[PDB]
Amino acid sequence: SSRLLPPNRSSLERSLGDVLPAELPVPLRELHDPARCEAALLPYLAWTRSVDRWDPDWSDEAKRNAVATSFVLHQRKGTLTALRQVVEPIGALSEVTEWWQRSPTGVPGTFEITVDVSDRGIDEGTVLELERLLDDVRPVSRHLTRLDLRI
Amino acid sequence: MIGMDRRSGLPLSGLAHLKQSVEDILTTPLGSRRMRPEYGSKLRRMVDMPVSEGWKSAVQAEVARSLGRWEPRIGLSAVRVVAVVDGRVDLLLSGVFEG
Amino acid sequence: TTCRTADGDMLDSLCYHVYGHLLGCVEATLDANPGLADEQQPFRAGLLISFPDMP
Amino acid sequence: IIDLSQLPEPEVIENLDFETIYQELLGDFREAMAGEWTAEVESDPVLKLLQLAAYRELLLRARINDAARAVMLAYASGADLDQIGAGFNVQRLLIRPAQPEAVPPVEAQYESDKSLRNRIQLAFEQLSVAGPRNAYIAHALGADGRVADASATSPAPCEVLISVLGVEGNGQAPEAVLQAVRLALNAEDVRPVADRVTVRSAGIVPYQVKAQLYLFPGPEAELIRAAAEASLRDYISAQRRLGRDIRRSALFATLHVEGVQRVELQEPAADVVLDETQAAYCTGYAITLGG
Amino acid sequence: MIIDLSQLPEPEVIENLDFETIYQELLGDFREAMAGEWTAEVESDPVLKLLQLAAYRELLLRARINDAARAVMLAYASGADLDQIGAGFNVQRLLIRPAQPEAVPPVEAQYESDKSLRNRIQLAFEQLSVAGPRNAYIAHALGADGRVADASATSPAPCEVLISVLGVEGNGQAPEAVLQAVRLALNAEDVRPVADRVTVRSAGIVPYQVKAQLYLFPGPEAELIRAAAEASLRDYISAQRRLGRDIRRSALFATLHVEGVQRVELQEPAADVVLDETQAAYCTGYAITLGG
Description:
This is part of a larger assembly, with one copy of chain A, one copy of chain B, one copy of chain C and two copies of chain D.
Chain A: H1 11-17, H2 42-48, H3 60-68, H4 70-75, H5 83-86, H6 130-133
Chain C: E1 2-4, H1 11-19, H2 27-31, E2 48-50
Antiparallel strand pairs in C: 1-2
Chain D: H1 18-32, H2 44-56, H3 58-69, H4 81-85, H5 116-121, H6 135-138, E1 149-152, E2 160-164, H7 175-178, H8 180-184, E3 195-198, E4 206-207, E5 210-215, H9 223-226, H10 233-236, H11 250-253, E6 260-262, E7 281-282, E8 286-289
Parallel strand pairs in D: 2-3, 4-7, 5-8
Antiparallel strand pairs in D: 1-2, 5-6
Protein name (chain D): Probable bacteriophage protein
Domain Baseplate J-like C-terminal (chain D): 207-283
Organism (chain D): Pseudomonas aeruginosa (strain ATCC 15692 / DSM 22644 / CIP 104116 / JCM 14847 / LMG 12228 / 1C / PRS 101 / PAO1)
């Protein structure tokens, strides 16, 4: 810089001291913070966090929490407590079924779940995603493809 | 040797480069340069000290050190006080040319 | 050997005062210092450099 | 499991060319010399300093980009995924390492790239021990004489249909290799769930390809015809790596190399389907030229 | 394809000189010629004033011959001696800045250095001279500016040569303004009895739309590999602005099947385009989409 020069300096040295270093940003620590990645390279981080399902229609607040909480989701896949948070952009947390609410010892099929989803933002469509968005959280043979919904 | 001028950027070679080579020695303090800490003069430490007859011989002994390091093509002859106005002492830096 | 700066202390001067030479002595200081080079080279008054041994 | 590290390069910082970096520095030089700039100031030793500076952050914008490549798993090179895989509990293993049977012929070998990268990609699918769709897969890749797995369930619940496919040669995997997955899935599954291990869960039909390619009047037809299988013989080994489909266009696009003007296909009348259950095998190929 | 002058062997006529091996010969030619009548080899003898002239002025004449032998060789001449090599090969020394000043200090007429004449005298052979073959009709057809590359043909042997000029301004058609701009150059830079039928082209914009029903996995990389296959489509078609112009169906499979797509469906390319040199091609656009 011009400050790194000795006290004796011309205006030429002080000018070339302000140009010849030519400092640059180093955007390298920002690559692993999902709240500080740029929007053009956010799905690179979503790949290494193994975000299984992705939509190019969400807001960035709904894209970055799927990467930031990709650990807590993938740590507990068989639980309900991350089935609650896997449906984050579709804002819905209403009701869930369990064994003893049905009196005759469960359904034939040993209680596949029929969860309750309550969306209010999008009304057209928004059904055909939830049987496959919830597929990774669902185990391969602990549930059946029976599903319940609400608009 | 052909270098460029400090101001105005013009490449001047023979003896105008010789004079600005000396005045980069005398006016840089020590350690002000980057990665070259043993460069420059202690004349900035001699700034605003009383002009005694031991101050004169300490400037002759320090210009000769600092020009002896980074100016081998100048043989220093003498440094003399030639005038005194309020604060402004002025020194006739005389030396023969070698190299 | 942790030292604290002033608002005008500079890196190549400091590790010349500590080590005695500058051949291989600045980048070894920048190696074992997190976020030192990110800070501006005319230092602020309260940043700490841990100078390593064998530069 | 699809490789991301074969795409065009992402630029985290922009990589400008040499001229607009240079003119940006002159715009910084006119503003710094403001009030005292003259046209005689920008002399020959002054401009060649600015041509150095325009060359050095051309090497710094290339340095920030090359650093940002090797941090992301997309375009990370060797001896650096060990720094990333330590953050994902992925350590490379030893495939017959340096045991000196005789001391000067040292035979050292580690795990290579682009499958170690898959194990870093399959890191978060190994945390959940309650068995999602990929934890039955990612724990079944512990063996060596196989290829990756696909999971499905047609029958009654807690009956897992996993298709253990294997790349070692002509089709069928050995049944002694089949028993290793139940030793690999004991404290990884759910305890009430119970799997059946089917090696070929749908069946194998024999496939071939016969292509009459044309090459340009030009370079030699010996290494360019053989270069068509360089993108094909690794493509067939990657079909049951995901257990997914081949197409008619898979028999076209895997034969286009540098120096192709037209191709030809006869072996399928229409394309075949290979689902998550269905897989197949290709017996023997014959790709020649029509000219 | 020229050879550098720094790898040439040294010639025969250029000699290293020595004052002693001329002067010790003049001693060894005069001492035997006196037959012992002169034997004072002290320098104060006035023959050694003169034998140090006949060995010094000869060394000047031996050097003038070496100076003149370098002046007639291309790898050693300089100054006004490459002007004589330059005047024989119709090559003149350049003018970077002009000769005449407007101010009181005279601006020197800046000529290029003699190290760049050796560039230009040696490139005076591989130079555009006449449009004989197919590689020279097109390079002599670079008089206009708003235009991309071109190729030539000849349907009969004895008379006619065909050049199908296409210029990228709008859709790639050749305007009638640059039809005459080509024909102004080919009248004196061709062989004289050419029937240079410089039309626009036989067929220019033959609109080749593309559509691709891309089928992807809906995961995280579905935005990145969709634009990566789209970027491979951009520089492909931009390389198809050509008379090789092999617009196809299966050559666009490898463009779009990049690493991880499931399949593709090309609708408007259904068959391969039949190829001749005379016609041209154009792509009007596309409507890229996801399968779902």
